[PDB]
Design a protein around this ligand. Structure first.
Ligand SMILES: C[S@@+](CC[C@H](N)C(=O)[O-])C[C@H]1O[C@@H](n2cnc3c(N)ncnc32)[C@H](O)[C@@H]1O
Ligand SMILES: C[S@@+](CC[C@H](N)C(=O)[O-])C[C@H]1O[C@@H](n2cnc3c(N)ncnc32)[C@H](O)[C@@H]1O
Lengths: 150, 161
């Protein structure tokens, strides 16, 4: 917990660089080794609580156009979304998809505050592109974005 | 003979009817390698013919911070929104929501066979696609997505062609 919380809180985002990757646009490359289980980066965006039926139905219907930049989770009895659609200097939102990626999402708690983070699912070598499973997407998203299959 | 004014008034009413009826004939959806879904012509279109409306939620943008927020979302959502100025106003056609409409499924090319045009009905601007050259049945419809941010070009380098 201790060292991970400071990494989250400072927003240091060390050990990573942005590159332009053929077929993907921008992506994030590791510039240091990460060990299995290490914190890599926060999936940092605007935390939205989804409580309105209009918003809920709109987000569902926007899955192909915007769903690559929104990550849904439940925390306690509420449905949340980290909306990363806005350009910032944060790196989590530039990480590309793979079903067999070297990172995986986890909910991390800081005195109850929910943070969606990426942890290393295996040892990662310097020079590897960071990737994680974007998760559930609609049929239309899979037709729009067939790279979601792998 | 009907005069130019009557003939031009009549031609406007034809585009009006196509927009308002929302028929979208002569087009089908295909899955296209490297692009996802795209729209294919199933009939010939002639240069200048109405192809389809870019149909979505028309939003007047009235605030500089909102224009800035749209710019900041251009890589993530900008392919499915079309921003334009019309007289004193700025608008965005927000086509992010999945619907049965085809205009929003048309892919990009800088040298595409369609082009955008504004068409005013009762003071409301409609954004339409017309054919920029004769189009054969079997061709993918394509148009220029237009001005995009630098970040968008990095996210979407196919925007350059
Ligand atoms: C408005 S949509 C068009 C329909 C889209 N292909 C779909 O399946 O939803 C915009 C998206 O289409 C894709 N796209 C459009 N033109 C493209 C092109 N020339 N090359 C590669 N991908 C393209 C990109 O994924 C883009 O963000
Ligand atoms: C959250 S972003 C990641 C950063 C993105 N590449 C960019 O430059 O903004 C999501 C978008 O990245 C691209 N992408 C992500 N994973 C991909 C993959 N495995 N293959 C191809 N494109 C991918 C798609 O354009 C997707 O809609």
């Amino acid at each position: 917990r201790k060292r991970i919380d400071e990494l989250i809180e400072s927003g240091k985002e060390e050990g990573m660089k942005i590159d332009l990757i053929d077929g993907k646009g921008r992506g994030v490359i590791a510039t240091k080794q990460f060990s299995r289980g290490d914190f890599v980066v926060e999936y940092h965006g605007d935390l939205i609580e989804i409580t309105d039926a209009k918003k809920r139905e709109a987000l569902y219907a926007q899955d192909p156009s915007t769903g690559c930049y929104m990550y849904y989770f439940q925390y306690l009895s509420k449905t949340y979304c980290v909306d990363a659609t806005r350009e910032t200097n944060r790196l989590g939102r530039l990480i590309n998809h793979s079903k067999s990626g070297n990172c995986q999402t986890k909910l991390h708690d800081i005195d109850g505050v929910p943070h969606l983070i990426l942890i290393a699912s295996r040892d990662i070598a310097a020079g590897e592109e960071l990737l994680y499973d974007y998760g559930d997407r609609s049929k239309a998203s899979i037709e729009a974005h067939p790279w979601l299959k792998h």
